[PDB]
Amino acid sequence: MSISDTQVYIALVVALVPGFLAWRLATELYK
Amino acid sequence: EVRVVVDNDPVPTSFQKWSQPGHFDRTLAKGAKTTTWIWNLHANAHDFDTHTSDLEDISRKIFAAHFGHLAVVFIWLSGMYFHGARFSNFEAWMANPTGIKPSAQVVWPIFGQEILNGDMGGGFHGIQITSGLFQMWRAAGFTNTFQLYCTAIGGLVMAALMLFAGWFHYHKRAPKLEWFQNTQSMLNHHLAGLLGLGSLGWTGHLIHVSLPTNKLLDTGVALKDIPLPHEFILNPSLMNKLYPHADWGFVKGVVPFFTLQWGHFTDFLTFKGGLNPVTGGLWLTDVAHHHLAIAVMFIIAGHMYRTNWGIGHSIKEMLDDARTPNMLPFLSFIGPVGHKGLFEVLTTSWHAQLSINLAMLGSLSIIIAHHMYAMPPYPYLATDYGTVVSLFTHHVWIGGFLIVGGAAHAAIYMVRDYDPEQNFNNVLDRVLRHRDAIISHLAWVCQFLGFHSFAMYCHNDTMRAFGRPQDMFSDTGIQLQPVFAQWLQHIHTMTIAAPNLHDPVSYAFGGGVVAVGGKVAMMPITLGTADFLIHHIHAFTIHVTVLVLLKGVLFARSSRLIPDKANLGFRFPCDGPGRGGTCQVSAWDHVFLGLFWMYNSLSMVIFHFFWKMQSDVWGTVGADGVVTHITGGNFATSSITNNGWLRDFLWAQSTQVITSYNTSLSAYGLMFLGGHFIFGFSLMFLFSGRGYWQELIESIVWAHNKLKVAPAIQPRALSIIHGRAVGVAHYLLGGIVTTWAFFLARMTAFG
Amino acid sequence: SHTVKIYDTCIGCTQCVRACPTDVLEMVPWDGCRAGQIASSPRTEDCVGCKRCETACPTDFLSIRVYLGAETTRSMGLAY
Amino acid sequence: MTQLTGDYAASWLPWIMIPLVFYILPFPVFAILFLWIQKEAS
Amino acid sequence: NDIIKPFKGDPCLGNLSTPINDSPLAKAFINNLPAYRKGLTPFMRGLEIGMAHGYFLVGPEVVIGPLRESAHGANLSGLITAIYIAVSACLGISIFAITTFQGNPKGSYSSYSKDSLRPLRTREEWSQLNGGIFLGAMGGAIFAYLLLENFDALDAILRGAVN
Amino acid sequence: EARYLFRYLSSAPVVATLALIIISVILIVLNYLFPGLQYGTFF
Amino acid sequence: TLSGQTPIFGGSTGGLLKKAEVEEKYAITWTSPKEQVFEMPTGGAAIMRQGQNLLYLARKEQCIALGGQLRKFKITDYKIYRIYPNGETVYIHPADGVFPEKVNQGREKVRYNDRRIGQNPSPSKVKFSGIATYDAPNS
Amino acid sequence: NTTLVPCYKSPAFVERMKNAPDSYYTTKPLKAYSQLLCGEDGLPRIALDRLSLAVDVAIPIAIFLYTAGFIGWSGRSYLQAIKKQDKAEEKEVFIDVPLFISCMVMALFWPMAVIKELLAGELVAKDEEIPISVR
């Protein structure tokens, strides 16, 4: 039983949270 | 006016200067302060242009040093004939030159190395030589080992003359500068007296020694019924059963030459032009006709230039008249001055001469390599597959070193002998005056070919890995046919204008297959997509070698970085870390990098040769006519991906040198590992610099100062240029010994 | 924009100024030498960094140091 | 088989993102990342 | 006398007056290419440069591309190659124009540069150029795509097969 | 003259080269002491 | 300013590039008593004139490379100028009118350290400070 | 170790004797390998057991270390022999072979020479005699 169709998209929007928290931190370290 | 003018006892003959080495340089001849003095004593031993200043005394050193060099070659030639005399199976190989392997240089029984004395056929144990000496002595008419021995004696006494002539011409009668500078008289004697009379002398030998001896050896007389070469002349009746259409008497047999009835000579001066099908070599009657044609045409050539009898040409103002009121309109761009002041370049400087004479001796050696496989001149040469590869490979490498040396002295000429006043606006100055358009377009064509030769190999390497063999540059995918080279292969075989040559010259071009001992002597070498691609690798690697070497010649004087690069010398490491870093800006450092590119280029040429013969030419013929090649058509399909080169050529064909232990090929296994060590060892000197090494000696000098065992010849790490010279001398040594071991282990394991 | 500092160990041998290909160095009067001279570097934006001045200095562990710093358009010697 | 497929879930997603991150987005990214390394400090 | 002069009479300039760059024919050809033609707006410079390039760029992919085996699919692979090469090229000259024209262009685009081999030195001139290059290389790509996907219909009408 | 010659014969490399030629006991000593001479064998 | 007749030179490829009229450019000006030929620092050979000579070079190293060549023709009256693109011409060599090997009065010890090079401070001393170890106002 | 047995009793090594030509090399040496500790593959080996081989792991080591020191001592003593002569600059490029030979005969009894070098405090240079770097 592989993971469902929706579980892939749930990971996509969850991984968008550290995607923006990386912007939080990269710009705060003054790129 | 040509004259012999010499000095009388100019230099005394004593061992005064033997006991004080480095005398030639005032900096060397003041003490050995460091170990750098030791290396400077050898890197400067032959740079005669820095020992003295006057061209008279320099040229006397050049001329006397050549004599001692000719002595060295005569010692080496004597060693070849002496080994062929009493350490070879040459007697056995004359009887049966198919099943007997050529071998001189047997090995002493010590250290267990008697295993190298492999079986050669006929019960003789030795090492299978691949130098082709035996195939050359048979074409010279040698039959017994006494003639070989007395030629070795005749070479040792000939080397003694060279040593005496060198001492005589430096210490007793040294010529003055006027004797050297008449190059116009030297061309007359070298064209006529050396090359003309030499090939006239040789065609005398061919007709009277080689042609009769090889006539009878083709009928199988087995070295009893062979007359000695003089018995062909003492007994002129003996050469009437052979070549009966001539007359063969002292006076009565020579007058057809003078009365111009040359039809009587048609039976021994033929124009057959093919391979003698019993030996596989060229027809010696066809070779004897060649040297006579060459002799006549070189003696004629030696009368072109004007010595002291008024008549002839003057090079001085044949050059000076190549200005531009008088050129073809499309090449009238080389200056109103043109070639003026260029006869003084090639007369007042030896590096100018050495640069040309090396670049043409190097190009000659590569041309010679291409001609001695496609039309083998020697009997039973083409079937000895180990000799065909080792003769082509030797002369390509020799020819490539010489070419790089022609570009070295083209650059030593620039930063030592280049004179702006005699070279104003002439043909040499106009090259330096646009040397950015020469290198820009060379660096572009080097880069155009780099993508369109090598990166097509990475295209093929990727489609065959994807599993798309129909979109790779194959004979089956996207064909790249050598259209203009398959055309010439058609031109050179339909012309058999030139109608008299009924037999096609160079079966390589097309037509027929020659099998001598069952093995194929020569086949047509067809060209497909694999030969389009490999020929553009050759074009690419030659160009970058030219780009590296030409850059070092044009920018030897100056650049935009260092406008005074000529004052720093020819051989300097750098000009400091400024301008971002000027490492390797000298003209020497472009010879050092061109040596790597010569290595890359030529090792691809000999790989193209070695695989294309094994797959398309060499092989054996059965009882029907089909040819089973050594690798069997492998080149056409698998030489187009450079994974195929690594598995179907390097991995596959190294089986003979890998599995060579405990056999007679054992020494090629050790050389093959030995070459790998030296290559890896070279990278110590190439990748590192002497600041690390000098600072390591200080920690090692300390350990000697502690135990009071320091030397007074202070240990210095090698120079920057020295360390780069060591690196390239080992990379090229190691990377060639591994190729030499791989070629010969593969082909002495077969035949 | 390199930094050619001169130290008090000069002997006024004048050799550092001659080797400079870009005229960065010049002599000024001094008193710590028999020569009464010492090198100075008034034109160091012109310093190309070749360290040819350091090769000519004969004092052991030489008195003139090129300190390769911020490299600009004339300290890298670009004709383009 | 003779095609790129996916037994895994959301098999349409490599179909679009392998072109995206590898030959559709980088040239915009290399342009943005170029505008940043070559801006005047005025 | 000599045919190779110093470049416009100044011996100190790093060039030569040669039959390739300073010939009556060669100057007449290069200085009337759309990059250099006197009297063109930068849009018409780029429009004419673009169409010449979009047109020929569909070629090398429709006959030796991966899709060459079929007919309708080969033309798509050639068109999109010209689409992608031009879009990335016009991306290149929008970011070239941004990063060189920033107050005093370091190089050949300075106010006191007096360079004839590149006369577009403004950023008002490089923006119409980008539009011309783009719209040109797109129309040229489509026209070479329409002429190739209709090749059988076009081979007939240049052979008289349509009466 | 045979005073500068004999100094040359003993200079730097001729002493070294002759030493390596004189260090050829490994050719005589290993020719008649049954060449195979491994560490546990010779006494 | 600057003036002089340019030497007889067929024009080179190593001469001035776009940096000449955009960043700045150099001019060496010398007087010769004879009509001889000298080596161009940008490759080639040119014939120097009889009166006042003027040559335009891309970088200062070329001018002093050529100036060092002029001293081998016994010419030591050359002057090197620096032409900014707006047009003014600075005198930069020899800066005081006498050659830098000579010692004048009025020149100043600039970038002189009053210590041996051996006692430059350790890099830990200037840690997180603007200066380097070699400026180092101590001693 | 007990896996190693003498080549006397080793099945893999008598096989080496069986298919052995002679010629000079595989009979006279190979008999002498019968006394060696011989692996489970018929190959003579160097093991370090106890007094059984305590003299045989000293014959090569004593012969080498003596003649390595002999080369080192004669080479060392010849260096100080010419430093004191104040001619060591060219005394090294031109070997003074009567002096070098006389320095070799001093190096025959070098092990007892080094002891009285050490016991006199004369072998090793003192620490502030030695050129060093900044440290």
Ligand code: CLA
């Ligand atoms: C016994 C006879 C003899 C004697 C006493 C001399 C003595 C002298 N020669 Mg002379 N010479 C001789 C024979 C002799 N020569 C011969 C036969 C030739 C023809 C080649 C020459 C050509 C010649 C030239 C061109 C010059 C001299 C010079 C000199 C003087 C310098 C000494 C020297 O070169 O240092 C070196 C001492 C040596 C022993 C050098 C020998 C190196 C040999 C030749 C190596 C070649 C073989 C080599 C081993 C190749 C194998 C390599 C292999 C291992 C890979 C000196 C007074 C030089 C001079 O006039 O000084 C200003 C000078 O330039 N000679």
Ligand code: CLA
């Ligand atoms: C760092 C861990 C990591 C790595 C090495 C990969 C690698 C890969 N993924 Mg991804 N992915 C990840 C995390 C990772 N993934 C996570 C956490 C998710 C949940 C949202 C996804 C969801 C995902 C999908 C839907 C797909 C891939 C696919 C792929 C393959 C093609 C590249 C691509 O398009 O991805 C695209 C990238 C993303 C979708 C976002 C992933 C970025 C993660 C979250 C952070 C990575 C940044 C990294 C830590 C910073 C380093 C940058 C620099 C310093 C080097 C490739 C093997 C494709 C495939 O299946 O191949 C057949 C595919 O379409 N991945």
Ligand SMILES: CC1=C(/C=C/C(C)=C/C=C/C(C)=C/C=C/C=C(C)/C=C/C=C(C)/C=C/C2=C(C)CCCC2(C)C)C(C)(C)CCC1
């Ligand atoms: C140098 C030279 C040469 C060459 C040339 C060339 C290189 C070529 C070419 C060419 C080309 C390459 C051409 C082209 C073209 C084109 C065109 C003509 C185009 C077009 C187009 C169009 C018309 C489009 C349209 C459109 C649009 C715009 C949009 C919508 C869609 C359409 C499609 C409608 C020679 C030697 C020959 C001679 C002369 C000189």
Ligand SMILES: CC1=C(/C=C/C(C)=C/C=C/C(C)=C\C=C/C=C(C)/C=C/C=C(C)/C=C/C2=C(C)CCCC2(C)C)C(C)(C)CCC1
């Ligand atoms: C026995 C044994 C072993 C062991 C060994 C060991 C563990 C050791 C050690 C030792 C040690 C712990 C040492 C040392 C040292 C120290 C020092 C400190 C030194 C020195 C030296 C010197 C001092 C030297 C001197 C000399 C000589 C002797 C001669 C020559 C010269 C010279 C100077 C070099 C083994 C297992 C291997 C083997 C078997 C048994």
Ligand SMILES: CC1=C(C/C=C(\C)CCC[C@H](C)CCC[C@H](C)CCCC(C)C)C(=O)c2ccccc2C1=O
């Ligand atoms: C190893 C190495 C060195 C050190 C190289 C040395 C020290 C050469 C070693 C040769 C040895 C010293 C030969 C000496 C032979 C002795 C004379 C011993 C002979 C005595 C017997 C014959 C009796 C450099 O100087 C160097 C410089 C630049 C780039 C890379 C490197 C580099 O890699």
Ligand SMILES: [Ca+2]
């Ligand atoms: Ca296809």
